[PDB]
Amino acid sequence: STGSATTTPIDSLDDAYITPVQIGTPAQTLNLDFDTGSSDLWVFSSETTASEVDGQTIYTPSKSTTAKLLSGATWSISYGDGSSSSGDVYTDTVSVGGLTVTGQAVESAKKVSSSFTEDSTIDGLLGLAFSTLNTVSPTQQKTFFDNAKASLDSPVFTADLGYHAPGTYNFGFIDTTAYTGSITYTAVSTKQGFWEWTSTGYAVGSGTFKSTSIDGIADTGTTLLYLPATVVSAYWAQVSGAKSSSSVGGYVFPCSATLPSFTFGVGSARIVIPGDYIDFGPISTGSSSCFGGIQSSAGIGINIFGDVALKAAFVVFNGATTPTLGFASK
Questions:
Q1: Are the C-beta atoms of 96 and 171 separated by less than 8 Å?
Q2: Is domain 175-330 given the CATH code 2.40.100.10 in the classification?
Q3: In terms of CB atoms within 10 Å, which end of the chain has fewer, N or C?
Q4: Superfamily of domain 5-174
Q5: Which of 35, 40, 146, 160 does the annotation list as catalytic?
Q6: Annotated catalytic, 329?
Q7: Is residue 35 among the annotated active site residues?
Q8: SS3 state of residue 307
């Protein structure tokens, strides 16, 4: 089997991407944030505290003939941005782009934090990291990908995120029309439950490539590119007037700037992030200070190849017995 679903930016900054997902019988379609940095499929639901719902589409298990309470199971998750959610669990039929999993754990939110409430466009998350990170207790649950894997033509999914445009998540096949040149594969460590890999270096603009190992995670659920302070300083030093602002919470730059590109290494291959991808616009409405898309990972504890980086590539998440990550230009 295979699946193919279009993913769409939630706003003009590509802050996140939503992908329609069918849950239950008859289908209830919710728009979920596919997150390769976590491993819970959770949804706004008929159980979500009413004051914490503001425009989201909810899953109502009582209206699904295939929903079953997973008795005794609870979940609770906290994300890198400090947001959180928790609740109980149902199993139900879940389909993505024509690919169907029966008996998928659908984690029903009883509580969500303010950032979720405030984002009316995101009806929940669909985790695509390794199932060892799943938070369901006392019986840990598998991700949609893990459940689908044995049925897939090939044990892979791909992320093809657009810059200010829709893109695609495919399951079970590599679309050879969706990228240019060849795919370069690189080793993954699953020790922390992430798609964790080591970039071979970077360049700023037309500058020389610096060979240096940068361990980090491929995380579709993180907006920006978070790298070591040394790397980030070298980037922003090339933008007149750019500075790190503790009041704003990161690097800002004059909105009048033209940003240089940023290149990262994948083995001997190179992925170029155009300068425009690094512009996250005014810090506040009407400001002439703009927020940078490359930020320091210092104090996160991990480097994160988020959407800014991933959307510059066609990315293969290879879930074979020895997992790997592939990157191609597009």
A1: yes
A2: no
A3: N
A4: Acid Proteases (2.40.70.10)
A5: 35
A6: no
A7: yes
A8: helix
